[PDB]
Symmetry: D3
Subunit: 320 residues, 6 copies
């Protein structure tokens, strides 16, 4: 039973904010400064996730959490620690912006893992208790690594985002495959930022968000876009549809955003003017989707929509 | 013409005071509007008309016509304004922002920051606020903050402008130019530069003209924006200068203090934090009342009020020239 | 009789904000734009101070103020003007971020003084009415000059912070001595910004805050640290303990911050996301300390704690 | 009777350097530091010009010169002064970038003239003794202003180059007209720098060089282009053909350069790696053209070719 | 038989330049602007290579050459074209930075290949006539890709250099493996730039040069390093020894450079002050090594030394 | 006897280059990459100096040298080490840009010394064998420290140049005093870069060069100036006259004295640099010989007459 709030009567938006936002407060843990990425999945009787909790030293750490309803979370006070047989890769430097999905027989976690700069760390868990670290998927610099929730043509597949070692002023989404969760390849460009005159919310850089959602018309990708104002970056988010069999081929891509920083909890915080989607839960029977997003890099919010309405919107307003 | 007005709050010593109804135009007035700021407002018939910068949910910059009985509650058209032009090259729309509007002699003219291989000053006219006829871009890129004078100056059209770059420009002097014909422009003269940081830091990074200049016996009243560069970005405040009537590039007085700076939450939080950007004014010479429209955090529009004579005293008393 | 508020019920924090914050509003003077540094000392039957009040021309001026209770302030409308025989040094360009303390027989004030760029101005007063300017202690560019409240083995001592002529993107704390409050030397590096992976609130630059506080164990130094986000700088503050006799030798240095921008008065204003400590009052009998800090470069706030608690926190969370 | 050297034996290039380069040395005047722009035209029985001569103070001044053979120049030691009835426009700050041509009944001079930054100064002369200064044609910031040598459908016409107030890191060529040499307008974009992968000698910025040369199929434009290497800008030059009636319409534009810094006098000097064409003499009856170019912002060189060969090259190698 | 010149009388240097430098001129081809990378190997009874020949449009293209003595080169006029099964990867944008070696049964080529930015293209050939292009090894941004000349414990191995999309101001060498020349992984950091105060010729960025040369004391890596002066980058090159079995482990790393820009052909040209090594030929029986390097990004030079002397220099001067 | 060459026939320049330039080659030492600062003084029956010799690791080191004629130098292969009882200040990180002068009873050496960034290191020697390091005079970031060759109203005095921790894009010359070679103060601004439209060779940044040369008409200061072209910095040098008694007061060049022209000034590790580092002079003949680094690679000499340089500085003054 995924979380849901009906669209307010007369609301014409494709996505609408939970009235309970923020659903995770910045100070939920004794040492937490902010909690703003929630890589959430169903698990047994309820829900589990991997959360970015930055502490009062401003260090970036991952913590495991569980919930009955996916709204109110019990997050472990102590950061998640990985088992790894390779001491070189198993060394912890930092970790942020997790994504989690089940593939075939286990849950896989990706995150932005420090290894001589940002790259994509990979691990798996069967139980959300023990996490086994695998090879970093790519050479630095790379972030926004997001796996597909099944193999594509017999290979594991991941979206990523080549970066630099700062506040990156550019960013294309890429796609890569692996036969074995160790060696990666067949890299393909998915999409670049839009032109400023066409769609400025996504004209500086873009990055994948929640795990792709399979639909009959393609993979639904929810992704962030940045606009560079005189005063900083603004992070909004929107939607595209990727080919099912060859997901680096984009079928439709929204001109308008789905959500942008409007509420005080989105506009004021450690990083003002940020809505950064990190996970989603959905139900194909009803078309409901619940999107988790970080707010001002301070707290976590939830927003709701219908998959068919999102698909319609994405087609109707497509810039390709 | 009955201009909008609120009396000075009891106890208030400031030369300008914000409307208690601010913001007077909300960000979601149109089905697809993301933000509405810059309101290029004038008296028109029974009421008021305007050209409004309404950025959409694709963050495209578009201009929309609006009308109002009271100049506070606006009815803005959902569909963007399109310009008529016989020249296909100049009539191609790329983007447009920060409109200014005034009547000159027989018609209303609109200038805006128009994209033509980068920012320049677009120019158009209308007789009825329904059909708009586009003329030559007045300048080569990069330029913006183009603001016309509301009558000819010794037989020529005149415009303030602001040479720029193709980014978030880290400089800006105000310039003055003339045209005999609304087509060719020239006799360019420097008006003013940003002040020294130690003299008046609200206006030390760059400056730009705001509302249409207001003719007084003491000179043209210029309301203009200024930028201060903090560690965390630009703060846009606005203040006042007085220009010579006959040669308006000659500045007579220029305020040290600002008239208004970002203070309220609707000025401080939004798409671009800490912006008060004046874009138009209505005034009544009989009473000296002036009402100044300004963009707030690049998100909504506000109003502020004051008296022309008090603004002139303030500009002279506090003048940094 | 230093101002005090007891720790809120259940509050686990080493420092807590006054419920009366902001304690000095931005519009206390007829042409003040902001009042956000308050260099406060006990004086006479009450308290005195030098205040940074930027005016509605956005000029940086210092003003004298007085208070019965250290919370409600009566600040002079006219800016403070220094007496100086030397015309060259006595020329006023600008002044900000004052610090004040009693040394031996008079009150000394330091400030960021414009002399072909930022340096550290120095003056004394016996009475908080007339101030007598001395030589600028250093060549530009320097700021965050903070004197020790006694001589250190027979020399005056000062912390400072080499800078540049902009929004400086670096900054180490230094220590210097003078026999005479005119000639300075024996410069020693105190500390550098921490590594991003270790303590990111203090990884861009750091600088001294309140006057150092003598404890049996060393000098308690309360200092600011900067984190560089994509949308600007975030100023937080924390604690270190310096050796009593050779104060450039750091004994402990906190990993977490004591305070970081959280409240709307800290997160919205002329410079968002700033907590900048500028003075403290303390009582060795009770262990109480009250810390004055600028908020968003707009208003002034107060936070409270206990010196022995701050000390034990600094030890236990030390990154050295 | 224009300066000429025959194509060297076995040279396959469309332009070839004079074997006597540089033809104007840096120290022709008693305080000249460099002489590297030579606006040159025929005049009387010989030749005249306006020369950029930077002095030993590194000031940028314009000097008149005269020559019998267009090779050996007698340059006036006193800088050129302009007559102007408007004292505002007539104030001299600096001047560089001259270009000179005859239009209908007199010579016109454009230069980069300081008026609150770079813009295009305009003046006329009948005799190279008195120059009457006209209004600056544009608002700053603009450089590389180059007049057409006749009216275009009854209007004066000028190419220009919007700039900034530094070492400008971009630059498109524009076209503008005037009915009266006072008011300017009908601004049209001519061309942008090419993409790096198409033609990198002209991918950073471009600007007009010598006065446009009329051919039966349009205007031959010789223009500089910049490549941004890790160690600086490299200035090369090449050729384009513009529509005769609407010269903003580009018909052909060379992929390859005509000339790039190769010789030591091009590679070493005040600004290394610079070939900047500033003027040309030509003879339609023979097809001969002699192109004057600055070398390393130090000295002046000459290069020779045939207009029909340049035209053929520009079409055959065109990137449009 | 590899090229050789004996060390000059009384030369104490570990490497010495050929008296015939530069061995390949900039204008060898009818449209060549510069020829400054030479990826050369033995082939049949003489030698072959892939050369970076930038043309007069300043486009970056690869051309095959052949030589009987590795000194006098006959380079094909037409750019090399790669055959590719996949149209998307097979699309040519640009290419530079070639390296060539034989591995097991064929020659492999790597190069800096444009695919939405710089990455490492891979191809093979049996005959230096037909080249078959494989998957790009990595996601952008990357270059200085250099294969090992045999498999390492049964996998192909490659050094690389994460980059950005400009004149990258950083750069560490990385190591990666592949079972199949398609999927890559087990990425390991090799080395970072040295500290400025330790070895400034390699303090900005580093990158691999010639193919690693197997010695009993490790893999001999010859690599470039950059020093950032006020006036640009200076490229020198030096040596390291890598563990034979785990070549990301660096055993010794030289303090001094082996070669730095000294000669006019290294210090003047399209990019001044560059010695950029691209290939080596060696003979284990005599210990002779001949290293090919680009000079000023304009021409190609050769330098000689003895492998045992280079090993001894590397260890004697090690900064590891 | 200071090194000297007569002004070439017909040469109208105030300074003229030695026909023997460069006088010190880049590879004088077994491991030298470049030798381009020569902080030279008369000593004994000859001359002595402290040389910036950057090595083949591109480390910046100081070496002592000696010469009979001040042209052909014998430089010690081993870098100079400084004696210091304070191990914190005595820690060597790097050192460049030395200047050397005699003050009253001994020789002093200043250099740009690494101490958490560039600052001005200070040391003395009685014999050019053992050097004793004193406190760094200033907090970082500071470079171009140049002592006066006598006390000024009973205090040591030094010119300096506030900088940053990179290739500094600005730079004013400052003046400071010390009663004791340990504690410094009375800091005064001497001059700023000129306006681009007035004198562009010195419009980005300036720094003091050789030790100030006393004359009856003021301290003759030879200093570098930078012009920022699209391709980098061009270092030229010129002259100013400072008040004798209060040397932060500038009394009087618009034109440069020397600017990069020769291949050895234009090509090398840092192209387009003439960086003056020391001068020898004889008041009785008016001769001065100025040592300058060329392209941060080698060392050159140029000659002039002090009266002519005074006359040039005054008649072309921009103040
Ligand atoms: C502690 C901190 O500021 N972390 C940020 C991270 O949140 C952000 O995504 C990244 C890109 O802007 O830069 C930094 O690593
Ligand atoms: C969509 C967007 O961000 N537009 C802005 C515009 O508002 C601003 O005035 C200009 C200068 O800072 O930059 C951009 O064009
Ligand atoms: C004195 C000097 O350096 N002048 C240059 C000028 O030559 C150059 O064309 C321009 C653009 O790079 O900038 C400067 O004005
Ligand atoms: O940098 C700001 C924003 O973008 C990414 O870079 C995130 O990890 C956070 O930083 C935030 O959502
Ligand atoms: O860029 C921020 C501010 O300045 C100008 O550039 C305006 O169009 C808005 O952008 C805002 O008022
Ligand atoms: O720069 C913004 C912030 O940091 C320092 O620079 C202070 O003087 C204030 O300006 C503020 O606390
Ligand atoms: O850019 C200059 C140098 O650096 C690299 O980036 C490549 O372009 C090299 O072949 C060249 O030697
Ligand atoms: O800036 C360097 C080059 O280009 C322009 O900018 C010219 O005026 C010269 O300065 C030179 O040809
Ligand atoms: O950096 C370039 C030039 O200026 C200073 O910075 C000197 O030490 C040398 O580096 C050179 O003379
Ligand atoms: K695609
Ligand atoms: K004016
Ligand atoms: K210390
Ligand atoms: K065109
Ligand atoms: K390693
Ligand atoms: K002075």
């Amino acid at each position: 039973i995924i979380p849901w709030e009906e669209r307010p009567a007369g609301c014409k938006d494709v996505l609408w904010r939970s009235v309970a936002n923020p659903i995770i407060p910045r100070d939920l843990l004794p040492t937490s400064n902010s909690i703003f990425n929630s890589a959430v999945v169903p698990f047994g009787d309820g829900f589990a996730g991997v959360f970015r909790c930055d502490d009062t030293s401003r260090r970036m750490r991952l913590h495991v959490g569980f919930s009955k309803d996916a709204i109110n979370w019990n997050i472990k006070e102590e950061p998640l620690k990985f088992q790894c047989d390779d001491e070189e890769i198993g060394t912890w430097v930092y970790g942020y912006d997790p994504r989690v999905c089940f593939i075939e027989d286990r849950y896989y976690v990706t995150w932005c893992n420090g290894y001589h700069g940002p790259t994509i760390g990979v691990a798996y868990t069967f139980d959300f208790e023990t996490f086994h670290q695998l090879e970093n998927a790519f050479i630095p610099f790379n972030r926004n690594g997001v796996l597909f929730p099944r193999k594509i043509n017999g290979r594991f597949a991941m979206l990523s985002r080549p970066s630099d070692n700062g506040h990156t002023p550019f960013g294309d989404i890429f796609y890569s495959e692996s036969p074995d969760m160790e060696f990666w390849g067949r890299h393909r460009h998915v999409m670049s930022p839009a032109a400023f005159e066409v769609s400025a919310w996504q004209c500086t850089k873009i990055g994948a968000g929640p795990i792709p959602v399979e639909t009959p018309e393609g993979w639904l990708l929810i992704y962030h876009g940045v606009l560079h104002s005189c005063n900083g970056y603004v992070y909004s988010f929107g939607s595209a549809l990727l080919d099912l069999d060859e997901p680096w081929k984009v079928k439709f891509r929204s001109g308008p955003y789905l959500l942008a920083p409007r509420e005080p909890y989105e506009c004021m915080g450690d990083v003002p003017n940020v809505c950064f989607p990190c996970a989603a839960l959905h139900d194909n029977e009803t078309g409901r989707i619940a999107i988790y997003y970080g707010c001002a890099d301070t707290v976590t919010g939830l927003a709701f929509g219908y998959i068919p309405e999102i698909i319609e919107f994405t087609k109707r307003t497509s810039i390709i």
